[PDB]
Enzyme design. Sequence first.
Site, short mmCIF file in Angstrom:
data_model
loop_
_atom_site.label_atom_id
_atom_site.label_comp_id
_atom_site.label_asym_id
_atom_site.label_seq_id
_atom_site.Cartn_x
_atom_site.Cartn_y
_atom_site.Cartn_z
N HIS A 225 15.83 2.93 -5.05
CA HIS A 225 15.44 4.36 -4.91
C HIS A 225 14.49 4.56 -3.72
CE1 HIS A 225 11.73 3.45 -7.48
NE2 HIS A 225 11.14 4.39 -6.78
N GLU B 290 -0.92 -6.42 5.49
CA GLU B 290 -1.79 -5.24 5.35
C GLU B 290 -2.78 -5.24 4.18
OE1 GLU B 290 -2.19 -2.78 7.09
OE2 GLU B 290 -0.47 -1.84 8.03
N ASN C 37 -5.82 -2.45 4.47
CA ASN C 37 -6.02 -0.98 4.67
C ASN C 37 -4.80 -0.51 5.49
OD1 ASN C 37 -6.75 1.57 5.81
ND2 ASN C 37 -8.80 1.21 5.19
N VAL D 79 -5.85 1.33 8.91
CA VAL D 79 -6.68 0.64 9.96
C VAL D 79 -6.03 -0.66 10.41
CG1 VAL D 79 -8.97 -0.32 10.49
CG2 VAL D 79 -8.76 1.59 8.86
N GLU E 269 -1.90 -7.82 10.59
CA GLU E 269 -0.58 -7.14 10.45
C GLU E 269 0.54 -7.62 11.35
OE1 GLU E 269 -3.52 -5.63 11.23
OE2 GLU E 269 -3.77 -4.03 9.85
N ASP F 105 18.21 -0.96 -9.98
CA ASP F 105 17.28 -0.39 -8.95
C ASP F 105 16.65 -1.51 -8.11
OD1 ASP F 105 15.73 1.39 -7.52
OD2 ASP F 105 14.26 1.68 -9.10
N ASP G 39 -1.60 1.43 -15.36
CA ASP G 39 -0.12 1.44 -15.05
C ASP G 39 0.12 1.50 -13.51
OD1 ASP G 39 2.71 1.92 -15.50
OD2 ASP G 39 2.37 3.96 -16.20
N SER G 40 1.36 1.36 -13.10
CA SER G 40 1.69 1.45 -11.67
C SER G 40 1.98 3.00 -11.61
CB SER G 40 2.95 0.60 -11.32
OG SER G 40 4.00 0.86 -12.24
N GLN H 224 3.37 6.53 -8.74
CA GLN H 224 4.07 7.02 -7.50
C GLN H 224 3.45 6.32 -6.24
OE1 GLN H 224 4.01 9.69 -10.33
NE2 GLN H 224 5.86 8.63 -10.15
N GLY H 225 4.27 5.74 -5.40
CA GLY H 225 3.71 5.07 -4.18
C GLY H 225 3.72 3.55 -4.38
N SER I 61 6.15 2.17 -6.16
CA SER I 61 7.63 1.95 -6.23
C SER I 61 8.14 0.88 -5.24
CB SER I 61 8.40 3.28 -5.89
OG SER I 61 8.09 4.16 -6.96
N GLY I 62 8.99 0.00 -5.70
CA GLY I 62 9.54 -1.06 -4.80
C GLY I 62 8.66 -2.29 -4.79
CA LIG Z 1 -4.11 -2.19 8.32
#
Ligand SMILES: [Ca+2]
Length: 223
Positions: A40, A52, A54, A57, A62, A84, A171-172, A174-175, A177-178
């Site tokens: 999804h 990553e 932050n 920043v 990264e 899914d 809980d986990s 929105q955001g 996801s995946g």
């Molecule tokens: Ca960063």
Amino acid sequence: IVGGYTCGANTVPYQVSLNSGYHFCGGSLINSQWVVSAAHCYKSGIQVRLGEDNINVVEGNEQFISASKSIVHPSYNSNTLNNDIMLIKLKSAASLNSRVASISLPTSCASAGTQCLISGWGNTKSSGTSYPDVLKCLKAPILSDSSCKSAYPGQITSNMFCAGYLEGGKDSCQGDSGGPVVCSGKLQGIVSWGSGCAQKNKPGVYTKVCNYVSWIKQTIASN
Ligand SMILES: [Ca+2]
């Protein structure tokens, strides 16, 4: 993640952020050129961001790599969220070290009672919104299939499991996801869905990765 804690920079080295101009989903690095996420979360123009902490920043660890191709599971059903899961191949291989590392796929499915680590940059409030800039973590147990089906009658398939607290509060969301659900050093789940976030008797539902290992392995071997 609601009711979690700040993981600490690069303490979850396989966590990736999928970016299309902004962070929209999490994912897990399974080898230097492949990431697994939720079907999804599919879209075109994805840049995978590794190392990553932050996401607003550049702190120095990264690696930003574009995706060369995405493969959504052949039987993904967006109305039921059954199957899914999706695979993303990177244009070039990432450089692996201690802060950026892959997570192993499981050889066996995990049992209810097992404690796992769920992480992500998703919403941290159950009502209202507040999105964190650094990675959040949550330790939660896998719930019995009986508890899971009883909380979501007619909605859980053999490719899903619930993990969390029936009391709510953690809980986990929105955001997230995946993203990953790791138990004993193996990737056992992918943040898939739930009714709201951290609500009593509405735990999170996760894609059961152990059921997809042959598909993952065969796909990577041929692409
Ligand atoms: Ca960063």
